[PDB]
Symmetry: C3
């Protein structure tokens, strides 16, 4: 489904913070003893509403809440870190969880450039037929 922002307002710009997990450390800064404290590990950036992605993202986070809260109600884990990894596994299982029937709509195998490996190899034997 498409996402329809139905909020009273939308801040169209996203001034965000996150961590850089693979930081190009300078000298000893990667050593915990010498590195930044908890407050100084963040990077920042600014994103504008190109393609309406910011207003759509606000609505998406909004619409995600019901399913996320129901998932949290059903789990006994106190802190859940595994949602994205489980999504990655389900991505793979949806495509590769069974036999891949080539040309099938649910089999992600492209034999396009391989048919030209053999349709140029029709003149293998039918062209050279002295």
């Amino acid at each position: 489904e498409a996402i329809v922002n139905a909020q009273p307002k939308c801040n169209p710009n996203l001034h965000y913070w996150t961590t850089q997990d693979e930081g190009a450390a300078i000298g000893l800064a990667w050593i915990p003893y010498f590195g930044p404290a908890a407050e100084g590990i963040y990077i920042e950036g600014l994103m504008h509403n190109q393609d309406g992605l910011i207003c759509g993202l606000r609505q998406l986070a909004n619409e995600t809440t019901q399913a996320l809260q129901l998932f949290l109600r059903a789990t006994t884990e106190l802190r859940t870190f595994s949602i994205l990894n489980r999504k990655a596994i389900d991505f793979l299982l949806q495509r590769w969880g069974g036999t891949c029937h080539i040309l099938g709509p649910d089999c992600c195998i492209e034999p396009a450039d391989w048919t030209k490996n053999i349709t140029d190899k029709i003149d293998q034997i039918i062209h050279d037929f002295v």
Copy 2:
């Protein structure tokens, strides 16, 4: 291996409880503040011994214990939530962890309907040969 129930008795019916993780919530019931308490999140059902699955399941849980206890002895995690996700990964790695040699017994790729895409395409060029 097949499962042979070797227990003194078997309750052939399984009156079970579980959680519905994607619940079709009614109104505000998905909001933790308004929703059910810990005791009211469960659904119930009843399963009979069709195909002997209940008596087999009791024996399976029984026979699983040794390996499960040895796994728990070797882990340092206090609470283990990852067994099923690891099983899913190993499912994928067993089939897709290496090169898939088509027609091989360990490669789950079916080219059956794709050979008829090219065996009906023998009359491509051998039929139309004026």
Copy 3:
């Protein structure tokens, strides 16, 4: 990249300890109540510097530290058990995260023994052509 041990010294032998997760238990030893205490769950072994793997491994662990410490700085998990499982997922996603274009350098599908299934099947119809 290759690994170049740049340490002051290298102990070329690895006297290691680990756990056997699938232990061939003898009798009741798998039962926690009867089994070994925390100090008696370990197996041991000895590895020599064949192919320079021990000296390389010491350097690898050394060189891994910066990236590992930066990963730990960016996570909010108190104890991280998921690095290897995430590596396995990324292994699969790198090969199977998109459409597999056969003969492509990033598609791990081998049609070698399947082309002989059809190149011996050129004499299907071109040999038997009465």
